[PDB]
Amino acid sequence: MTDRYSFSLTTFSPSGKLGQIDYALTAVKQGVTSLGIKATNGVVIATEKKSSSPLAMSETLSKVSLLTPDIGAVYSGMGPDYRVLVDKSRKVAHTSYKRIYGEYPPTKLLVSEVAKIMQEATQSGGVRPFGVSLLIAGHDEFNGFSLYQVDPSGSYFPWKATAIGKGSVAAKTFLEKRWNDELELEDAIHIALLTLKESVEGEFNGDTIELAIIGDENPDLLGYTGIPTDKGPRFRKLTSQEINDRLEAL
Amino acid sequence: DRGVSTFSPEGRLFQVEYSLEAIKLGSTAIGIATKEGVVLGVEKRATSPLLESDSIEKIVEIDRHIGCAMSGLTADARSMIEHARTAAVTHNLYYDEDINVESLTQSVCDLALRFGELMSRPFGVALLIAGHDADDGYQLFHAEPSGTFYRYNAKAIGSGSEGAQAELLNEWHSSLTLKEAELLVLKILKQVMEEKLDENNAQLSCITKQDGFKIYDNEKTAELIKELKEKEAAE
Amino acid sequence: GYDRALSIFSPDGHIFQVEYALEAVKRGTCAVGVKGKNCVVLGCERRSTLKLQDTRITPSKVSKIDSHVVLSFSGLNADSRILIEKARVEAQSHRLTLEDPVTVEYLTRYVAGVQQRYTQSGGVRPFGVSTLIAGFDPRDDEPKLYQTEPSGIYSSWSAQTIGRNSKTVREFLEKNYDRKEPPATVEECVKLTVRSLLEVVQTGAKNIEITVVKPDSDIVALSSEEINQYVTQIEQEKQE
Amino acid sequence: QFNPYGDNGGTILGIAGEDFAVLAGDTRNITDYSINSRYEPKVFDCGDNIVMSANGFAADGDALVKRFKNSVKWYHFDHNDKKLSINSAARNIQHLLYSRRFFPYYVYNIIAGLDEDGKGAVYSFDPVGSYQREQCRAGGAAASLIMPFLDNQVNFKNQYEPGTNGKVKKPLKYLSVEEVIKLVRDSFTSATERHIQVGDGLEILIVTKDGVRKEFYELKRD
Amino acid sequence: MDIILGIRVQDSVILASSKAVTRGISVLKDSDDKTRQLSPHTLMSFAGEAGDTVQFAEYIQANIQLYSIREDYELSPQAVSSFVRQELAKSIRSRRPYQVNVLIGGYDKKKNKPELYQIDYLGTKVELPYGAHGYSGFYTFSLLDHHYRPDMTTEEGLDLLKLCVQELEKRMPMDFKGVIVKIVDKDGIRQVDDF
Amino acid sequence: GSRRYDSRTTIFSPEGRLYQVEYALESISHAGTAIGIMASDGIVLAAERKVTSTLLEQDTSTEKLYKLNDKIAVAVAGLTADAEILINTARIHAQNYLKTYNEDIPVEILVRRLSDIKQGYTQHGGLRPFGVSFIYAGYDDRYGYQLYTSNPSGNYTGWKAISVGANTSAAQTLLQMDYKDDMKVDDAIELALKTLSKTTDSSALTYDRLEFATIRKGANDGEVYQKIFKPQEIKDILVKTGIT
Amino acid sequence: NNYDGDTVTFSPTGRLFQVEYALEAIKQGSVTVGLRSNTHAVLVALKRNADELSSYQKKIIKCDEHMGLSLAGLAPDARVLSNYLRQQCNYSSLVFNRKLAVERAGHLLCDKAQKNTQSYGGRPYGVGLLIIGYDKSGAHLLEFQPSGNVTELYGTAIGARSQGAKTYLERTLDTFIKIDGNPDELIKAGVEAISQSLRDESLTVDNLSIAIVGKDTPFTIYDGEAVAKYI
Amino acid sequence: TTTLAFKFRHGVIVAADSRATAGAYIASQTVKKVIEINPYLLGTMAGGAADCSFWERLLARQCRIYELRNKERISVAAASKLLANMVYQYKGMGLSMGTMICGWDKRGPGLYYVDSEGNRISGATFSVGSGSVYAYGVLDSNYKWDLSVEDALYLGKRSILAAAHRDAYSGGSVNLYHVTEDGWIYHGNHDVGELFWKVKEEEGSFNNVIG
Ligand SMILES: *[C@@]([C])([C][O])[C@](*)(=O)[C]([C]C1=[C][C]=[C][C]=[C]1)[N]C(=O)[C]([C]C1=[C][N]C2=C1[C]=[C][C]=[C]2)[N]C(=O)[C]([C])[N]C(=O)C1=C([C])C2=C([C]1)[C]=[C][C]=[C]2
Ligand SMILES: [Mg+2]
């Protein structure tokens, strides 16, 4: 046995293209649309719960994932790749930061660590690149609210608002017209629901849409009282009912 | 592509057979074994006149009682010589005696097939290993990159090998003296060399029981060349 | 680990990777070595395609391995740094274990051995570099000049050149250099080295580098003006 | 705490002649004040006309002999059935001993045979490999009882020629095999009297160009 | 080994080191030079357990000489002293630590100032005007505390050193067989052949 | 076995070139142009962000200019992810040197180390090389202000003025024309921006499409200051030089 | 064709071509014969030279006092396998004070050769071996193929033109098996058997190589004037 | 043991006793404490018999390989250093060695003291062993550079005798060596029993002893 694939499977072609990265980006294009919008007092990330079967319980499959109490993530592309990246992202947030500094990492540095993992799958031996693009929304004390995109190459960019996957080109145009620097969080959620309706074909309700926010601290979700400085997670996943309430005022 | 340790349909290792082709391109080396000693001689073959020919080291000492001449990719021989010298001296450490010429040759040949995917390819050099011991007397061996070694009364390797071997077939007999063997190597080297043989582009050496392994001076070889010319002109 | 055999024999008995490494040397800038009666001179070409260069900080072509030995090269620049570093480490390791500086022949034999090792080791390619190693042995006044190449063979030279258009400058050296009477002085040795490079270089401005090595660790690099004076004198004698 | 060493007693004796050599040893094996065996061979024919005995801790002695016999076997395989000379065996044994410099073989080793000129040879070793060729050597429990007697009766030490009074020594005349075996038997009979670990039996191995011959003699069993 | 002294004056550093090597009850040598030149303007004296001393000194020397060749540049005495300290601080938690105490005396050609560093086997570094290792400082520090000025000449530093040595030769029970004295200044390193 | 699928990233072509290095250089030629100019009293680093969007958060963005330590910075041209791997290694190397010798690392030594890492990927390991070309801008007390470049081959050279990435042929010609030895930082700032403005593939050169940085002795007395320009500060220097 | 690049690849008909190519190297090798009675076992080998100045390549190798083999094919591979047998025979003696059974020696060779036929990177052994020995169940003769197959036989032959000697032994089966307590007559039958594989060349003094092992006979090799008796 | 060596005008003298001891018991009286590394290099043995013997034979092989590789005989300094570095690996592990590497090289006559503690010292005069302290008295008082070969051989012999007499763990016989630029020369085995009485009579020394 032994892993005898100690050589790179991603290499430069004569034109200077890294083929496997381009092909990974193509897989991301086929994926379901997901988006992120940054407000003055929060960030929103959203996507469609494309259920493979109506017998399947789509609640058990979580496309929007908590990485830290103040950082969330959503993707477009290959789901299994995303799931393992979330596991690694959660772990690296502890091993490379929290166990050293005693606090959770700021958004940009956690993004940097995830990016590094995706870059290594692009150069290391006997592996293919991750077939996903991530949108990572988060908050920290010194940088405030932020929204980042991470691609299969490992490159990452900060966004005011953006979209990835199936109908990203149309969705990014829609966001350019609606976005401004004075948006409140509720306005951003409203714009997110409008933008997402364009890319969805079938049912459009709280059960087929997955949406989460980075906003105010939630002391009710902390699980304990007694420490004033601990005020709770800023990440919150909106319920099916909470989404439907905002679809009536749509 | 294909494996490095792959057999051909004829039952030969491709890489070993290809290394033998590299040895055919190498400069000529000749060895002759007699009861008075073993003589080793080589073609230096300098690529340019500015190259200081005395730095060309194709005849090499392994121990006081064992010498070695090479032909082919000579850079590959350095690690083989290093191993041989270590093996010879290590045996002297463990057993307080000289090592048998055959045993030394066997140790060198054990390296040969240690290649795969150990080193990445076979050696591209053949060796003539000459020496003396108390058990089997004066001996001459031909060590190949196949891991095989044959003992020889006389042997030529390199570019003019098959032409030289046919000449050694006729000339060698069991009663040859050392002086006769010296002239015989010079004769055959002069015959297969491209350029005209002199003391600067050819080198002689021998191994005797008394004096051990000796590389000949250019002044000493020059006299043997002059002695050769006169005896050929004598009839 | 990556164990792939990259340097292997072909049906005609050639190791193409080693031969293609020589093609990289052929592409490299010209380097020349000439030994006189009491000195050795190393000349090197600098291609003038690169201007706006900072000549203070740009890696020089001639590298000191120890206080008494120097090394110049032709071929891949990045590859040459690895050989030079290894050589420098070995030079100090020799002083440390044997209490003598390396002989020029020993240092050459080490560098050549490294090059050879990379022609039959798994997962590595040969060095695309040929070197000229020059200097004087400790407590000796006999000049030493050696050459190495990717295959790992090495040899001593009265005068030698490597790199692009080395065929031309070698042609010049073969007819101009006399063994019975080599360049008796430093001037004669440098002049012959500059003359040989002027057959190939193009302009004699900042394209020629000269480094003179004398006995007892006396090594110095000539400046632009000093070299320019040689270029002036050569061409003025040529106009006749 | 576990002690990996022990003491099995016994005593051995090697004497070199002009064209022969003997290696003798008692056949008693012991621990503390008990007897394990009255006949447990201690001197072995190792091949190539070489005899050997490793005296002290029997488990280490058995292992060393076993390894040297094995070394002789592989010397034949690797060097075309060449005969292992006594000097080459001695050097090989040094390396067997020093390979365990930091966990030694607790034995005193003696080998005997013929050198390359056909003359008798005895080599003695320390537990970690220091070896030396000698004409006469006793090793083991009663080594200090026997060696002074051999200095006197083999090398004629402190013996001078009568009449001269200390001016002229006794000349070093060689001994015959019959004269040597007498010194061996008297050595072991005397050692048996004064050393409690020596007794039961005496087994002598004689080495000539013709081969390896054995002789056995009983000793006191108290 | 026994006594190593160091003193930084106006324009140089003076290092004085004992000449004796001892194994048990016998003096093996009485002309031992307990110092290595690390670079042309940096000298290191040393003392500690046999073997460890020379092995460590020559190991440092080789590393600095390697740096000099690679960069064609002489490291500052401060850079060298920091390198040496790290090697000793690394050594102290190793399987078998180097049992060596050193003094590094160098002339910084950039700042045109002499510098003296004291480093013990634990990797304890301190820059000083004058220093010593072992039982040496116990006898000499009172004289140095008294007589030392930072504007002293080289000749005045040597006279103060003779005084320190005279006190050692009187009150130390061990005979260290005199000292070898070396001066480090702008022109390099030299040995005082008469002391 | 696995041999079937090996691309063999570390081999020579028949012409004596390294395939992957040449193809990596081809990749870099499509990257945003980065320019470095060295003056007597400082160094300038200018670089062009690639086709941005209005919704990109510029003030918190960094794709071109990175800080290695207080004295040394780099401009990137190629794969950003690959560059960050090397940048973090260089940051660690600079700190190792500072811990060992208690002095800031000389610029060349840092450059050589990174270039040696790049070289390793071309000679052994069977992995693809880093698709990155750096411009190093730095200062030390030996050589003063220094500009270097390194590319995927692991070869590095020193420069008075240099460009990497797209349109370097055109950019180098413009720099070679207007550059003079007695030049100052303020003049070099103007030269860098004018060169980008003429070589750019975009319709017009604006503040949102640029990253800019200087290394000046223009710090209070004998010391060096790194200035990574903010979006508003790039906007002001564009008006000052007369481009917008 | 497309399935002979390495040893790890079956062909569409279930064949292993690299093993078959290794088998081909044996057929190119010089002839060697093996046969036994109830008391003794004999190896006879035709040695091959490079030319008239060269020596005749040795074919027979001793493994222990009671066991040894003759080779045909790549000689270095025989050196590796015989070295392994030497070690295994030796392990049996040192640990168990037991002479290694010839049948068990064959099982060990089979298993060593097999590993080289199922793994990537390596190659099959390019040599065939005839192992003879005398153990607690009497005389034995084994034939080893580098495919891994080992076979116990009364007599056999391998190498070039080996079919002639193999046919002779198949006729003589009933005769030579009964040659008990007569080493010279058993060797005669072996020399007569190998003679059926000769063309042009004949058995000379430095050409022939014989080995024997038996009840009160250690494994010994006969070369030179020692085999002139049987010419 | 008692061993000594010293440099002088005409090379280096090397002398040693021949006694081996196992506690109070005299194991041997015929031991060789001088080791032949090469025709121009000697090594002395003191302390662990096995240790000194094994490592110096290991050195001799190391020196021989050096000659093959470099086409040149090893220097005394390099040889002593190879030994020193070899034993330094095993420092604190229990090795017991006190040796002198004596020879003639391009620098002239050479003499280095090397021990298991780690010392490696160049010097004109050395003596190591339990009897070294007795030998030093005779050496120091009679040692000159302008010493004849005859007088130098006697000095080294007389110095061992002094130690053999007083030290209980030294004696047996004296082995002498003289190292020249043409190689080392063995100057015989001299029984101390016979030598003592001879020197007593001829020299007049050892008056306190009766004979
Ligand atoms: C003087 C006799 C010192 O007293 C001299 O140094 C000789 C040198 C010498 C002797 C023989 C050959 C070459 C040189 N030394 C000895 O004779 C030593 C004394 C000694 C033993 N250990 C030791 C010694 C000295 C200094 C440190 C340590 N003799 C030996 O080495 C021999 C006789 N060894 C032994 O007796 C034993 C060893 C070794 C050993 C024994 C006994 C038992 C178990 C393990 C090892
Ligand atoms: Mg009794």
Task: Check which CATH number belongs to the domain holding E5 and give it.
Answer: 3.60.20.10
- End-to-end C-alpha distance for chain H, whole angstroms: 26
Residue whose token pair is 């594989």: G197
Sign of the dihedral through C-alpha B57, B62, B65, B67:
negative
Per DSSP, G224 falls in state: G
The residues, any chain, with a CB within 8 Å of residue H157's CB and separated by 6 or more, are H15, H174, H176, H190, H195
Q: Residue D49, SS3?
A: coil
Residue F66's Cα: distance from chain center in Å? 9
What gap in Å lies between CA D148 and CA H28, rounded to an integer? 11
Contacts of F2 in chain G (CB under 8 A): 120
What gap in Å lies between CA A54 and CA E69, rounded to an integer? 74
A60 touches chain C (CB under 8 A): no
Q: Could you write out the DSSP letters of every residue in C191-235? A: HHHHHHHHTTSS-SSSSEEEEEEETTTEEEE--HHHHHHHHHHHH
Cα H49 to ligand 1 centre (Å) = 5
Q: Could you write out the DSSP letters of every residue in C71-85? A: EEEEE-HHHHHHHHH
Q: Are residues H184 and H159 in contact, defined by beta-carbon separation less than 8 angstroms?
A: no
Residue whose token pair is 């193409």: C16
Contacts of B100 in chain D (CB under 8 A): 79-80, 82
The residue type found at H161 is: L
What gap in Å lies between CA C129 and CA C148, rounded to an integer? 9
Q: Could you write out the DSSP letters of every residue in H63-115? A: HHHHHHHHSSPPPHHHHHHHHHHHHHTTTTTT--BEEEEEEEETTEEEEEEEE
What gap in Å lies between CA G128 and CA G160, rounded to an integer? 12
Distance from the Cα of G144 to chain B's closest Cα (Å) equals: 17
**Interface contact E110-F99, CB threshold 8 A:** no
Q: Which residue does chain H place closest to E22, by CA atoms? A: H119
Given CATH 3.30.43.10, say whether it is the number of domain C1-240: no
**Interface contact C100-H81, CB threshold 8 A:** no
Per DSSP, G227 falls in state: G
Long-range contacts of E90-99 (CB under 8 A, 24+ apart): E90/E123, E91/E121, E91/E123, E92/E121, E92/E122, E92/E123, E96/H91, E96/H92, E97/E121, E98/E48, E98/E52, E98/E55, E98/E56, E99/E48, E99/E49, E99/E52
Reference F154, options F132, F137, F184, F170; nearest CA is F132
Cα→Cα distances C106→C96, C137, C141, Å: 15, 10, 17
The C-alpha torsion from B184 through B188 and B194 to B200, rounded to 10°, is -20
What gap in Å lies between CA F170 and CA F29, rounded to an integer? 12
With a Cβ cut-off of 6 Å, ligand 1 is lined by D 104, 126-128, 130; H 1, 19-22, 27, 31, 33, 45-50, 52, 96, 129-130, 169
What gap in Å lies between CA C144 and CA B54, rounded to an integer? 13
The residue type found at G134 is: Y
Q: Are strands G217-222 and G60-64 parallel, antiparallel or unpaired?
A: unpaired
Provide the number of structural domains found in chain H.
Answer: 1
Residue whose token pair is 């020349």: C32
The residues, any chain, with a CB within 8 Å of residue B144's CB and separated by 6 or more, are B20, B109, B112, B126
Label residue D166 left, alpha or beta by phi (over 0 means left) and psi (-120 to 50 means alpha): left
Q: Which residue does chain B place closest to D95, by CA atoms? A: B94
Which residue(s) pair with E39 in the sheet? E42
Q: Are residues E107 and E80 in contact, defined by beta-carbon separation less than 8 angstroms?
A: no
Phi (first) and psi of residue E99, to 5 degrees: -95, 70
Per DSSP, B64 falls in state: T
Catalytic positions of H: 1
Q: Could you write out the DSSP letters of every residue in chain A? A: ------SBS--B-TTS-BHHHHHHHHHHHHSPPEEEEE-SS-EEEEEE---S-TTS-TTSS-SSEEEETTEEEEEEE-HHHHHHHHHHHHHHHIIIIIHHHSSPPPHHHHHHHHHHHHHHTTTSBT-PPP-EEEEEEEEETTTEEEEEEE-TTS-EEEBSEEEESTTHHHHHHHHHHH--TT--HHHHHHHHHHHHHHH--S--STTTEEEEEE-S--GGGSS--S-TT----SEEEPPHHHHHHHHHT-
Q: Are residues H135 and H15 in contact, defined by beta-carbon separation less than 8 angstroms?
A: no
Provide the number of structural domains found in chain A.
Answer: 1
Phi (first) and psi of residue D186, to 5 degrees: -70, -35
Q: Could you write out the DSSP letters of every residue in C3-49? A: ----S-B-TTS-BHHHHHHHHHHHHSPPEEEEE-SS-EEEEEE--TT
Task: Check which CATH number belongs to the domain holding G205 and give it.
Answer: 3.60.20.10
Sheet arrangement for strand H98-105: H34-38, H41-44, H98-105, H108-115, H120-122
CB atoms within 10 A of CB F141: 12
Determine whether H68 is exposed, middle or buried from the number of CB atoms within 10 Å of its CB (0-12, 13-18, 19+).
buried
Label residue B37 left, alpha or beta by phi (over 0 means left) and psi (-120 to 50 means alpha): left
What gap in Å lies between CA G9 and CA G12, rounded to an integer? 10
Which residue(s) pair with A150 in the sheet? A134, A156
What gap in Å lies between CA F9 and CA F6, rounded to an integer? 8
The residue type found at B120 is: S
Q: Are residues D172 and D115 in contact, defined by beta-carbon separation less than 8 angstroms?
A: no
Q: Experimental method used, please? A: X-ray
Contacts of H126 in chain E (CB under 8 A): 28
Phi (first) and psi of residue D37, to 5 degrees: -145, 145
Cα→Cα distances D209→A47, D110, H88, Å: 99, 19, 46
Resolution expressed in Å: 2.7
Sheet arrangement for strand A34-38: A161-164, A34-38, A43-48, A209-214, A235-237
Q: Which ligand is nearest to the CA of D145?
A: 2
Q: Are residues F61 and F122 in contact, defined by beta-carbon separation less than 8 angstroms?
A: no
**Interface contact E86-F106, CB threshold 8 A:** no
Query: Could you tell me the residue range of the domain that residue F192 belongs to?
Result: 1-244
Residue E42's Cα: distance from chain center in Å? 10
Provide the number of structural domains found in chain F.
Answer: 1
Q: What is the helix (H) or strand (E) element at residue B84, kind and residue range?
A: helix B77-95
What gap in Å lies between CA G199 and CA G172, rounded to an integer? 21
Distance from the Cα of F12 to chain B's closest Cα (Å) equals: 16
Reference E66, options C66, C136, C82; nearest CA is C66
Q: Are residues B46 and B58 in contact, defined by beta-carbon separation less than 8 angstroms?
A: no
Residue whose token pair is 């979209």: A163
What gap in Å lies between CA F175 and CA D47, rounded to an integer? 88
Query: Could you tell me the residue range of the domain that residue A194 belongs to?
Result: 1-250
Determine whether E71 is exposed, middle or buried from the number of CB atoms within 10 Å of its CB (0-12, 13-18, 19+).
middle
Per DSSP, B158 falls in state: S
In degrees, rounded to 5, the angle at the alpha carbon of residue A34 between the alpha carbons of residues A31 and A38 is 155
Per DSSP, C62 falls in state: S
Reference H172, options A104, D134, E45, B64; nearest CA is D134
Reference F171, options F154, F194, F195; nearest CA is F195
Q: Residue D60, SS3?
A: helix
Biggest CA pair distance of chain D: 63
The residue type found at G157 is: A
B10 touches chain C (CB under 8 A): no
What gap in Å lies between CA C40 and CA C141, rounded to an integer? 11
What gap in Å lies between CA C82 and CA C128, rounded to an integer? 11
Binding-site positions of H read 49
Reference G70, options G165, G136, G137, G181; nearest CA is G165
Interface partners of chain D (CB pairs < 8 Å, 3 or more) are: B, G, H
Task: Check which CATH number belongs to the domain holding H195 and give it.
Answer: 3.60.20.10
CB atoms within 10 A of CB G153: 15
Q: Are residues B50 and C170 in contact, defined by beta-carbon separation less than 8 angstroms?
A: yes
Residue whose token pair is 């439907």: A244
- In chain E, count of helices (H) and strands (E)? 4, 12
Provide the number of structural domains found in chain G.
Answer: 1
Q: Are strands C208-214 and C218-221 parallel, antiparallel or unpaired?
A: antiparallel
Q: Residue E40, SS3?
A: coil
What gap in Å lies between CA E100 and CA E119, rounded to an integer? 9
Cα→Cα distances C239→C193, C195, C226, C232, F51, Å: 19, 14, 21, 11, 59
Reference G19, options G154, G119, G133; nearest CA is G119
Cα→Cα distances G176→A119, G35, G188, G213, H210, Å: 75, 8, 10, 15, 88
Provide the number of structural domains found in chain E.
Answer: 1
Which residue(s) pair with G54 in the sheet? B152
> For residue G223, what are its two tokens?
């070369």
Query: Could you tell me the residue range of the domain that residue G196 belongs to?
Result: 1-231
Reference C15, options B73, D13, B95, D193; nearest CA is B73
Chain C residues interacting with chain F (CB cutoff of 8 angstroms): 2, 4, 6, 16-17, 20-27, 50-59, 76-79, 81-82, 118, 123-128
What gap in Å lies between CA E163 and CA F144, rounded to an integer? 46
Q: Are strands B29-33 and D44-47 parallel, antiparallel or unpaired?
A: unpaired
Sheet arrangement for strand A156-158: A65-68, A71-77, A132-140, A144-150, A156-158
Q: Are strands A235-237 and B29-33 parallel, antiparallel or unpaired?
A: unpaired
Q: What is the helix (H) or strand (E) element at residue B168, kind and residue range?
A: helix B161-171
What gap in Å lies between CA E51 and CA E29, rounded to an integer? 15
Sign of the dihedral through C-alpha F124, F128, F134, F138:
negative
**Interface contact B95-D82, CB threshold 8 A:** no
Contacts of C26 in chain F (CB under 8 A): 16
What gap in Å lies between CA H54 and CA A50, rounded to an integer? 79
C116 touches chain B (CB under 8 A): yes
Cα→Cα distances F23→A100, A155, C140, E37, F14, Å: 41, 20, 50, 49, 16
The residues, any chain, with a CB within 8 Å of residue G189's CB and separated by 6 or more, are G35, G42, G172, G175, G176, G179
Distance from the Cα of B53 to chain F's closest Cα (Å) equals: 30
Query: Could you tell me the residue range of the domain that residue E94 belongs to?
Result: 1-195
Which residue(s) pair with G109 in the sheet? none
A/C interface, count of CB pairs below 8 Å: 6
CATH fold, domain D1-222, is: Glutamine Phosphoribosylpyrophosphate, subunit 1, domain 1 (3.60.20)
Phi (first) and psi of residue A65, to 5 degrees: -125, 140
Task: Check which CATH number belongs to the domain holding A12 and give it.
Answer: 3.60.20.10
Question: Whats the size of chain C, residue-wise?
Answer: 240
**DSSP collapsed to 3 states, chain F:** CHHHHCCCCCCECCCCCEHHHHHHHHHHCCCCCEEEEEECCEEEEEEECCCCCCCECCCCCCCCEEECCCCEEEEEEECHHHHHHHHHHHHHHHHHHHHHHCCCCCHHHHHHHHHHHHHHHHHECCCCCCCEEEEEEEEECCCEEEEEEECCCCCEEEECEEEECCCHHHHHHHHHHHCCCCCCHHHHHHHHHHHHHHHCCCCCCCHHHEEEEEEECCCCCCCCEEEECCHHHHHHHHHHHCCC
The residues, any chain, with a CB within 8 Å of residue A10's CB and separated by 6 or more, are A18, A19, A20, A21, A122, A123, A128, A129, F128
Cα→Cα distances D35→D38, D139, D192, D200, Å: 7, 20, 14, 10
What gap in Å lies between CA H19 and CA C124, rounded to an integer? 58
What gap in Å lies between CA D148 and CA G11, rounded to an integer? 81
Reference B146, options F239, C9, F122, A69; nearest CA is C9
Cα→Cα distances G186→B110, C180, G41, G209, Å: 36, 76, 8, 15
**Interface contact D88-B97, CB threshold 8 A:** yes
Residue F223's Cα: distance from chain center in Å? 23
Distance from the Cα of B147 to chain G's closest Cα (Å) equals: 6
> For residue C68, what are its two tokens?
């008494």
> For residue A14, what are its two tokens?
């004569």
Q: Could you write out the DSSP letters of every residue in E126-182? A: EE-SEEEETTHHHHHHHHHHHH--TT--HHHHHHHHHHHHHHHHHH-SS----EEEE
Reference A45, options A165, A181, A129; nearest CA is A165
What gap in Å lies between CA B146 and CA F68, rounded to an integer? 54
Phi (first) and psi of residue A211, to 5 degrees: -145, 135
Reference G74, options G42, G119, G26; nearest CA is G26
Interface partners of chain G (CB pairs < 8 Å, 3 or more) are: B, D, F
